[PDB]
A paper describes a structure:
Adeno-associated viruses (AAVs) are non-enveloped ~25 nm viruses that encapsidate a 4.7-kb single-stranded DNA (ssDNA) genome. The AAV cap gene encodes for three capsid subunits, VP1–VP3 that assemble into a T = 1 icosahedral capsid at an approximate ratio of 1:1:10, respectively. VP1 contains a unique N-terminal domain (VP1u) that harbors a phospholipase A2 domain, which is believed to be responsible for endosomal escape. VP3, the major subunit of the capsid, establishes tissue tropism via cell receptor recognition and antigenic response by the host.
We found that AAVv66 contains 13 amino acid residues that differ from AAV2: one within the VP1u region (K39Q), one within the VP2 domain (V151A), and eleven within VP3 (R447K, T450A, Q457M, S492A, E499D, F533Y, G546D, E548G, R585S, R588T, and A593T). We obtained 52,874 particle images, which yielded a cryo-EM map at 2.5 Å resolution, and obtained a structural model with optimal real-space fit and stereochemical parameters. Overall, the AAVv66 structure is similar to AAV2 (root-mean-square deviation of atomic coordinates = 0.456 Å). Of note, VP1u and VP2 domains are each represented at approximately a twelvth of the VP3 domains for each particle, and similar to other AAV structures before, were not resolved in our symmetrized cryo-EM map. Therefore, only residues 219–736 are definitively resolved within the cryo-EM map, including 11 of 13 AAVv66-defining residues. Key differences occur at the interfaces between monomers of VP3 at the protrusions around the threefold axis. D499, whose mutation to the longer glutamate residue resulted in dramatic defects in vector genome packaging, forms electrostatic interactions and/or hydrogen bonding with S501. Here, the backbone atoms of D499 and S501 respectively interact with the side chains of the symmetry-related N449 and T448 amino acids, whereas the hydroxyl group of S501 hydrogen-bonds with the backbone carbonyl of the symmetry-related S446. Our observation of the strong effect of D499 mutation is therefore likely due to the disruption of the interface between VP3 monomers, leading to destabilization of the capsid. The polar hydroxyl group in AAVv66-Y533 (AAV2-F533) likely stabilizes the polar environment between the side chains of R487 and K532, and may contribute to the interaction with L583 of the symmetry-related monomer. AAV3b’s physical and functional interactions with HSPG rely on electrostatic interactions conferred by residues R447 and R594 (R447 and A593 in AAV2), but AAVv66 also lacks these arginine residues (K447 and T593). These differences from AAV2 and AAV3b suggest that AAVv66 associates differently with the canonical cell surface receptor commonly utilized by AAV clade B and C capsids, consistent with our findings that AAVv66 lacks heparin binding.
Numbering used by the authors:
A (entry chain I), B (entry chain K): 217 to 735
C (entry chain H): 246 to 429
D (entry chain H): 614 to 735
E (entry chain F): 217 to 245
């Protein structure tokens, strides 16, 4: 599609369509793109005095990129409620992306007074990295996605990446990418850009909670035909003697029954309380944290493998670094109080996954004998074993959607730990840049590269449409289920609306696990 | 094929052909086969005074076997350089094997003077174990493969195997195999033997190194929208109070960012230095070694799961038993100095795999509270967790190629730990034997089995051709890459050549990971 | 991306060596108001990684054919009122382009001059000015020296919205020897 | 970073016409491409004058240029046994990576790179 | 060509032939 100056190159599409087992969400936003880095590539690195854990080396490019990797970019709160109250699972199917109504504007800063004017002949460059040749920076939970509220205008974030480093320096293996070394399409006002994408096959996300516990799967009315060791000594005349005795497990001793499965793996975290007085009076945010050690550096495990946030009757506690934490509206960046953030809770999976702040279990450490008593120890980290079952972390209305699976020789259960769908060929990155326009050149030749350009930026509309496949529930449960609902009581503001000043805000995080399912 | 005495039954084929995404390597050697065990099967077992860890029971057969399970049996150094400098991966596709120009010769040892003569009517027996019914002894890194230099003549190794043992004795379950109980083809001088084989589907070997680190995958320019616990106490009047505070991770605190993946598993090894003075003055080669315990026996873990050999700026260190160690030319068998061996290095995988001599990470062990401080401990062994990614051990020009996957109920990521391709149906074993020729018998009947034979051996040519599938690199990296190269400076000998005495030698081990790839 | 100024203030000018120059440095010629495009350096076409691929795996190479394109023209007028510069589009102005496909002008490429395309694709470069030398006798000219008016060629005029392309086929040349001899 | 071609001078005789600075000698090299801004006269006088114009509107131009070249390769067919010399990057650490930009955005080429690494018999 | 032990695999050719503007020389050692 291409036409003149006075022709819109696209329309505004924003709604959702529910049809059978599909739902199609399309959203449109308006964006603004500045000139980053003053048209330059720049090598960046960590500060000289930074600790060894915080060293890095990389580059920052003059390009921007579009990002729609959060659920609230596509679902309204009402649409999210429809989804989570009536379906056991869902997954993305295909995607459509469109960029249109481009406007480039030049700025003049004469005498502290700014004048903005159209530049009808300038252009912007766009290309999609459909072969995954650039370092993939999506899927790191960065800011700069499409806003949740359709009436908001957002700035396009700048592209940059990191490569191998040795302290603050680079090594011979580190690679540098010039994004101008890709074929890209140049658009003037009156051109548009589209492409399509098909998701690979992925398992449905489990939008349910189990109505049974992994350790409670037996018939409570019938005993087992297997025996377990129930007593190791028996009373003799005024004393005891070693004597093995066996029993069949029933309901009275349900903890001893033979079982076929084991709970999911574990990697223990430290426990903190939402009540301030319960926590220790010290700075253990890093010393008491759970981390992994890679190439001599320590890195915080956050949020880590999916484990239950707490056991029953203990909502006040949560793992130190084991849950997603969103910020309330207009909360700051650094060292905000607990009233400014929204802490998620993964308690629905405590039917199969162990609690994040307890041990996995206990194993024996010695060989008991006539003169040696049996000894056990706690297991604070347990890799996977044959016979384990577990659930993955839940997804949230304002959480990520997908993540690119790293191209490696091996990987196990490649669902991203922050939640979502792991894809070997995720939706490609979409890079965009204003073409530089040089200022008045000299009338005598000079071989030095240009350094004076016309100050300008661009704006336009972006739309993205995604088809999702649903998995309807088929429960024979008799009593009603738990549903997500709004409270009826009066209040100064309605949730998920704007306030008197025009600020849209999301008052709480919303998971997906409300319906139930048998184990 | 079959013809007379004065007809060659085959030609000499030895070269490589590069065509598109295939490379076909064919090699030919001349072999010599003695008479092993004096035509007998013999039960063998460990010495009576051996330690319990070294007990064994088995048999030695009068058969030999052909082995070409090392890369330098097929690739010249120049061909290996072509492969590793231009491809991201490779794998075997199909195989052709041929045995021809058999000559049997009888030896006479009259009066200390040896006379060798042709025996035109004697024969050799050959068969391929195409149904995997014999114990598979290939894939244990044994000597006796085809020589790397095509002009060398090699002796065929003897076949033998081990079965179940109880100390130095056997058990009822142990099995005994008579190789004469197989259909085999008998060849006189003038017959040849061929067969073909097709490799099953296996993943390409990763001939690249990652240009990104697993803990450095974010955009260093944009903060996350997630929060982490950054401070646990705050200053009060001349004191502190417990108070939780949260921050959004950026580049300044990059170690705290939320991430989607975890490094590969770990099994910690002891660290030793190539500088003699750095190591302890004691004998810790066995006491300080990492081992596994199976049926009451301890067995050294060598080389074990793939972990990085060292962190940056520490080339002098290497895990005690975590790397492949090749010997230099003409180095001895027992207790040679470090200058006689070539120690490999797996540093290219420290972007995803933990260092072999460090802990995997740290986990909390208790529950902090108003009067209890948080405590952590190191994790020295970590089984696989959902969300882990890792690389496999590299392959080398003089290392093994494949290994037979044991026929068991379960196995996880069945790539052999010494490196290479794991096959459920590997290339079959090829057994060969000289047919016994009895000496002058008595003229009166005797039921005792024969014990006097004509001393003889055999020789001939062997050829093997393998097709390999290549995976070409498609990088958009701007700066040049690292390549394997020869040094230009003058020297007394050229590498990978013969010396003044005719001895071919390989001066260093050569891996495959030179090109780079994004994570 | 390129930028083209107005050279010589739209004039042709006779140029010559200084009066006091040594005899070895005398010259006579002209400078034209035209610019010219130049891509006669290898790094205009090969990235360092591409150059490495070439030289590590091939014994020789040579060019075969060529495609050239000029597009997205923008003409801008400058106003220097009161030391303050204002730049604006001039939608109706044009640029002239032509290729000397019959080798009738003095060929100044192939003298290792600056002004080629930059090696890094993100750089913006200025188009160099065209000029040539002819026969001279000291600082003066002779009757044999020739003068070329470039407006005396058919050229294509482009407004913003027009583009210019052409194609070219290299003649047969021997491969460049990308090897070293292993014998003396 | 060296030249590619050079035009062979149109003369009666020449010997081995490969340009001495290196590259390919062509009798019909890629043609020159000339470009110029068309002059736009400024405000003229309202009474006729035969003198040529001397006042123009100050202006310049900008745009994009693209060039595509096809190259024919000659693959090596060596039977050499030992490995060859290849161009490679050094692995050791450094403040900047070669053939990249620095912290200020300046691209630089740290060394000249020839073509003669593979070997051939005489 | 291939045969047994008691078969010559070739003959002795050694002479020259002059015909017009050609000359064919064959030698055996």
């Amino acid at each position: 599609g291409a036409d003149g100056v006075g022709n819109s190159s696209g329309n505004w599409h924003c709604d959702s369509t529910w049809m059978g087992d599909r739902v199609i969400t399309t959203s449109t936003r308006t964006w603004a793109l500045p000139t980053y880095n003053n048209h330059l590539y720049k090598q960046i690195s960590s500060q000289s005095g930074a600790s060894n854990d915080n060293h890095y080396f990389g580059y920052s490019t003059p390009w921007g990129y579009f990002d729609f990797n959060r659920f609230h970019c596509h679902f309204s709160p009402r649409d999210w409620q429809r989804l989570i109250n009536n379906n056991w699972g869902f997954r993305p199917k295909r995607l459509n992306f469109k960029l249109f109504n481009i406007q480039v504007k030049e700025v003049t800063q004469n005498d502290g007074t700014t004048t903005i004017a159209n530049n009808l002949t300038s252009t912007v460059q766009v290309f999609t990295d459909s072969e995954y040749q650039l370092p993939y920076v999506l899927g790191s939970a960065h800011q700069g996605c499409l806003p949740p509220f359709p009436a908001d205008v957002f700035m396009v974030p700048q592209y940059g990446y990191l490569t191998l480093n040795n302290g603050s320096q680079a090594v011979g293996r580190s690679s540098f990418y010039c994004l101008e070394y890709f074929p890209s399409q140049m658009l003037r006002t009156g051109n548009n850009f589209t492409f399509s994408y098909t998701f690979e096959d992925v398992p449905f996300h489990s939008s349910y909670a189990h109505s049974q516990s992994l350790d409670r799967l037996m018939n409570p009315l019938i005993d087992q035909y297997l025996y377990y060791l129930s007593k190791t000594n028996a009373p003799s005349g005024t004393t005891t003697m070693s004597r093995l005795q066996f029993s069949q497990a029933g309901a009275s001793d349900i903890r001893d029954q033979s079982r076929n499965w084991l709970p999911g793996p574990c990697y223990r975290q430290q426990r903190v309380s939402k009540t301030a007085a319960d926590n220790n009076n010290s700075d253990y945010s890093w010393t008491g944290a759970t981390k992994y050690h890679l190439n001599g550096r320590d890195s915080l495990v956050n949020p880590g493998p999916a484990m239950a946030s707490h056991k029953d009757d203990e909502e006040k506690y949560f793992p130190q670094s084991g849950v997603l934490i969103f910020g309330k509206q207009d909360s700051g960046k650094t060292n905000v109080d607990i009233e400014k953030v929204m802490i998620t809770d993964e308690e629905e999976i405590r039917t199969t996954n162990p609690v994040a702040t307890e041990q996995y279990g206990s194993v024996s450490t010695n060989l008991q004998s006539g003169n040696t008593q049996a000894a056990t120890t706690d297991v604070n980290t347990q890799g996977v074993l044959p016979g384990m079952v577990w659930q993955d972390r839940d997804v949230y209305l304002q959480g990520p959607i997908w993540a690119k699976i790293p191209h490696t020789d091996g990987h196990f259960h490649p669902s991203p730990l922050m939640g979502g769908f792991g894809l070997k060929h995720p939706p490609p990155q979409i890079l965009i840049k204003n073409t530089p326009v040089p200022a008045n050149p000299s009338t005598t030749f000079s071989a030095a590269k240009f350094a004076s350009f016309i100050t300008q930026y661009s704006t336009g509309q972006v739309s993205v449409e995604i088809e999702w496949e649903l998995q309807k529930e088929n429960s024979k449960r008799w009593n009603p289920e738990i549903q997500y609902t709004s409270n009826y009581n009066k209040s100064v503001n309605v949730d998920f609306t704007v306030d008197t000043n025009g600020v849209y805000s999301e008052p709480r995080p919303i998971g997906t696990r409300y319906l139930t399912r048998n184990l």
